[PDB]
Amino acid sequence: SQEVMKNLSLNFGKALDECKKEMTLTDAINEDFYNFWKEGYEIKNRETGCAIMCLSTKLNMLDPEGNLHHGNAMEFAKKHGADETMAQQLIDIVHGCEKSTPANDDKCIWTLGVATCFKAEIHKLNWAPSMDVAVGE
Amino acid sequence: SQEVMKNLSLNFGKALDECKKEMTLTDAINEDFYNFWKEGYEIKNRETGCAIMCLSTKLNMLDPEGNLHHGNAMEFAKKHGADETMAQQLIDIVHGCEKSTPANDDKCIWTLGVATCFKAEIHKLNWAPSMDVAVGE
Ligand SMILES: CCC/C=C\C=C\CCCCCCCCCO
Ligand SMILES: CCC/C=C\C=C\CCCCCCCCCO
Numbered sequence A, B: 001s002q003e004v005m006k007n008l009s010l011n012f013g014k015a016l017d018e019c020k021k022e023m024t025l026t027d028a029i030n031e032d033f034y035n036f037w038k039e040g041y042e043i044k045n046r047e048t049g050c051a052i053m054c055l056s057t058k059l060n061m062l063d064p065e066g067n068l069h070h071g072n073a074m075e076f077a078k079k080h081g082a083d084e085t086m087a088q089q090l091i092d093i094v095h096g097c098e099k100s101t102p103a104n105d106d107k108c109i110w111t112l113g114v115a116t117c118f119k120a121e122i123h124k125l126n127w128a129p130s131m132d133v134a135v136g137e
Helices: A002-013 A016-022 A029-034 A046-058 A070-079 A084-100 A107-124 B002-022 B029-034 B046-059 B070-079 B084-100 B107-124
Strands: none
Touching: A002 A070, A016 A046, A029 A046, A046 A107, A070 A084, A084 A107, B002 B029, B002 B046, B002 B070, B029 B046, B046 B107, B070 B084, B084 B107
């Protein structure tokens, strides 16, 4: 649901300021987060991949290979309002996008690739929200 | 708590190198200690069963019948940050896993079975650490 996706999106972005400082990321990521759920907007900055990776790492959502930790993603999803089925469906998109995008040793570009694939799949479910406030803000 | 399980996992395995040097053991067990908590991973080596016994025995967590000593297991769990409810929950998993695992006269193998049952239940509670997955150092 769009509603849940808004709540997940705002809770996922809350540490962005903390990641921006800590990783010295430029303001190039600002347009990607402001536009994250705008259908047809292409996210293409490498640093946004870095930012997303930092955000996941901070929510304990990553394993030591860099793939999603299913336990903590499920717990995150549930904490912000998804039921079991919606939570599993989101895990399955992320997991599907990890297997469907080309392996890349540059973790920031690979995380970007996962995130773009995830965004597209959420648009296809008609779950992308209309945000009044940007992710990260 | 995953933070607590991290603290107990680091500290339970601190004497592994001492364990390895004293006994028998191939470096084949390192794969099980380094990857213990990963969601896909199954602990697999027989000497890891033997390592866990030496670590338990050295921490004074094993009774005369070979079973967990609940009093000292409580002390170890609390020392490393478990409150009483989580401590008791860990004891009850161990104790349940001592019952549900098939009897065996190889103690190394039986301990491997109790440890794999313990791991599975910590995954079910979402208490396995997501990025810091090792037992020991
Ligand atoms: C698992 C639930 C995700 C929820 C909300 C996401 C909002 C925008 C961020 C999407 C990126 C998720 C993919 C990340 C895995 C690798 O960091
Ligand atoms: C009850 C406390 C155990 C704490 C931490 C364990 C980390 C690795 C898990 C190994 C399985 C435990 C097996 C029982 C042996 C007694 O310590």
